[PDB]
Amino acid sequence: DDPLLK
Amino acid sequence: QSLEALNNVSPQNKEALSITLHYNKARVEEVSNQSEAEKLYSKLMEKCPGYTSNKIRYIYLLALKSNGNNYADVQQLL
């Protein structure tokens, strides 16, 4: 759910 | 040189690129010296617990050091 991970 | 140039990175992608570069440096350390690799692994895990490769490598190094005495950690990661 993290945009950083995406 | 990449880490030096990281200071010029845009703030939006700065965190992601810093995490990637620290992971690469930790891999190079794991090739050279496992202690600094584990230190940077802990640093990145605190920085980003959601990453999997960092946790996988850290638990793998621990299992190498502990002779597979951290089965609970492997099950938790699974």
Query: Quick one: closest CA in A to B50, which residue?
Result: A5
Question: What's this structure's resolution in Å?
Answer: 3.9
C-beta contacts of A1-6 below 8 A and 24+ residues apart: A2/B50, A4/B15, A4/B16, A4/B48, A5/B48, A5/B50, A5/B51
Q: Which residues of B11-48 are buried (b: 16+ CB within 10 A; e: fewer)?
A: eeeeeebebeebbebbbebbeeebeebbebbeebeeeb
Tell me which chain B residues have a C-beta less than 8 angstroms from the C-beta of A5: 48, 50-51
> d(Cα B6, Cα B46) in Å, to the nearest integer?
20
Please tell me the experimental approach by which this structure was elucidated: cryo-EM
Question: Under a CB-based contact definition with an 8 Å cutoff, are residues A5 and B50 in contact?
Answer: yes
Query: Quick one: closest CA in B to A2, which residue?
Result: B50
